[PDB]
């Protein structure tokens, strides 16, 4: 049902069954499917298509020509009732596309809160984007990709299927990410390789001098010590016993399946 | 107000306050904000969104799914009443996005006349595009970028913030421009580097044999003589005393702040 305080433009089409929260705004020429839930205060500027079993949070701003919850591009998808979940206060720009998941991939494409998805950014089926992330113009996430908190993906960069972009990572524009990127790392080029720690990002997010140094030492263990990953893992876990921020590496390794970029 | 000779499709929404010139054409499903000015003979095919304090010239052709004058993507922008100015006879293709400026950047995004902005070209906040330019498919200008007259930016090429693309320059597709490009130069690759003078372009624009040779000599001074830029500047100014076309370099150096690509 549509909340009494929500605004639905006369030219917009909200199908019976859709749930529109208080003070939400559905601009002209928008289409909202019957299985869609739009949270309180969320705004759909105009020309926005939202369908499928999709739940959108509060205070989001979705711009014209964006396509949310739409059928994915996986050739295996056959119309199964999969889903999309989007959090709060996200800024979804013109032409962004966020597709529903596939049964084979888990049936869910998820986006957190406080993210900025710039023009033509693409979030394919079964992706999981965290919070406070930035996908720049034309940034493209292939299916089954994970983008962790605070990560920034440069313009025209494509992340290959199943890859993980660690927390606080910064991927340079015009890049091709074919493997997993540990947290706190700066990567760039096709295929992408590591170029150090995102020090400036960590500074702005409140990390102490000690944590940043610990993180740099962890980085050196992985890419400088020359010791195989399995010999480095226990070393990093050891380091994390004193500097908690380093556990991010540990949690990341447990999820990695594509190997680390090098 | 709307000129009596202008056509506004019944499905289009032109908000009170908008100024539509004589013989202009606002196609179906278009949205024109109250602070917009559309010049004589300008055509909005259909599905075009134009808002903000935006002034558009005469005889422009704006295609479906384009977004003009819209809120920019700068995280610092807070809704201040900034502006966009677009000239005459521009061809703005499907999905092009031209965003309003930021107070911090000068409050204005400007586009000249006779430009061709191809599919999904992006002109970010505070950019200044001259006249007779071509931004190919997916060409992306980050904020505060200047693109001088006759410049051509290849497909999928991104120009980094604050950079200047000199007059008559040709940037190859799939490139990443991280510094300033002197006029008359051909650049390509990520990051972009110089590969000579755009001789064919100069030929087609009426440059004499003498001017082209002078320009090539100026190019050699910058990238071949081996002399530091500051030693070359007075040399080029000297050369310009005889061949005026060479002063373009002088005027360019005075505006450069990102250094020259090399």
């Amino acid at each position: 049902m549509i909340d009494k305080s929500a605004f639905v433009h006369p030219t917009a089409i909200v199908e019976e069954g859709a749930s529109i929260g208080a003070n939400a705004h559905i601009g002209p020429f928008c289409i909202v499917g019957p299985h869609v839930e739009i949270g309180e205060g969320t705004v759909l500027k105009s020309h926005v298509v939202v369908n499928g079993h999709t739940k959108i949070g509060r205070d989001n701003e979705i711009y014209q020509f964006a396509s949310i919850g739409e059928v994915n591009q996986d050739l295996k998808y056959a119309g199964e009732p999969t889903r999309v979940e989007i959090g709060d206060r996200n800024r979804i720009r013109e032409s962004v596309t966020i597709h529903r998941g596939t049964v084979q991939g888990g049936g869910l494409t998820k986006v957190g809160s406080d993210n900025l998805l710039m023009i033509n950014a693409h979030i394919a089926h079964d992706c999981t984007v965290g919070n406070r992330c930035i996908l720049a113009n034309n940034a493209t996430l292939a299916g089954h990709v994970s983008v962790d908190d605070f990560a920034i993906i440069g313009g025209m960069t494509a992340v290959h299927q199943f890859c993980i972009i660690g927390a606080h990572v910064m991927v340079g524009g015009c890049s091709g990410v074919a493997q997993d990127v540990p947290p706190y790392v700066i990567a760039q080029g096709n295929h992408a390789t590591p170029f150090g720690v995102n020090i400036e990002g960590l500074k702005r997010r409140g990390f102490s001098r000690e944590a940043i140094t610990a993180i740099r030492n962890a980085y050196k263990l992985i890419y400088r010590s020359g010791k195989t990953l399995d010999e480095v893992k226990p070393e990093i876990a050891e380091l994390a016993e004193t500097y908690p921020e380093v556990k991010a590496f540990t949690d990341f390794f447990a999820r990695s399946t594509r190997g680390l970029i090098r | 107000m709307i000129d009596k000779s202008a056509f506004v499709h019944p499905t289009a929404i032109v908000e009170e306050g908008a100024s539509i010139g004589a013989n202009a054409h606002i196609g179906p499903f278009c949205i024109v904000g109250p602070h917009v000015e559309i010049g004589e003979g300008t055509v909005l095919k259909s599905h075009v969104v134009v808002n903000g304090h935006t002034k558009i010239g005469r005889d422009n052709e704006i295609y479906q799914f384009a977004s003009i004058g819209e809120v920019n993507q700068d995280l610092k922008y807070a809704g201040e009443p900034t502006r966009v100015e677009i000239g005459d006879r521009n061809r703005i293709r499907e999905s092009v996005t031209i965003h309003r400026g930021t107070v911090q950047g000068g409050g204005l995004t400007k586009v000249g006349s006779d430009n061709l902005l191809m599919i999904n070209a992006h002109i970010a906040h505070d950019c200044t595009v001259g006249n007779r330019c071509i931004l190919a498919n997916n060409a992306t200008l980050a904020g505060h970028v200047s693109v001088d007259d006759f410049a051509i930016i290849g497909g999928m090429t991104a120009v980094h913030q604050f950079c200047i693309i000199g007059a008559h320059v040709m940037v190859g597709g799939c490139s990443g421009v991280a510094q300033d490009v002197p006029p008359y130069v051909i650049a390509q690759g990520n990051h972009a580097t110089p590969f000579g003078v755009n001789i064919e372009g100069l030929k087609r624009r009426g440059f004499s044999r003498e001017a082209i040779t002078a320009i090539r000599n100026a190019y050699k001074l910058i990238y071949r003589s081996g002399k530091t830029l500051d030693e070359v500047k007075p040399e080029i100014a000297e050369l310009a005393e005889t061949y005026p076309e060479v002063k373009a370099f002088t005027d360019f150096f005075a505006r450069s702040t990102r250094g020259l690509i090399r």
Partner: peptide, 12 residues
Amino acid sequence: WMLDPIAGKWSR
């Protein structure tokens, strides 16, 4: 300091 998301870098 200046963040350039499209470039994917922190600029100075």
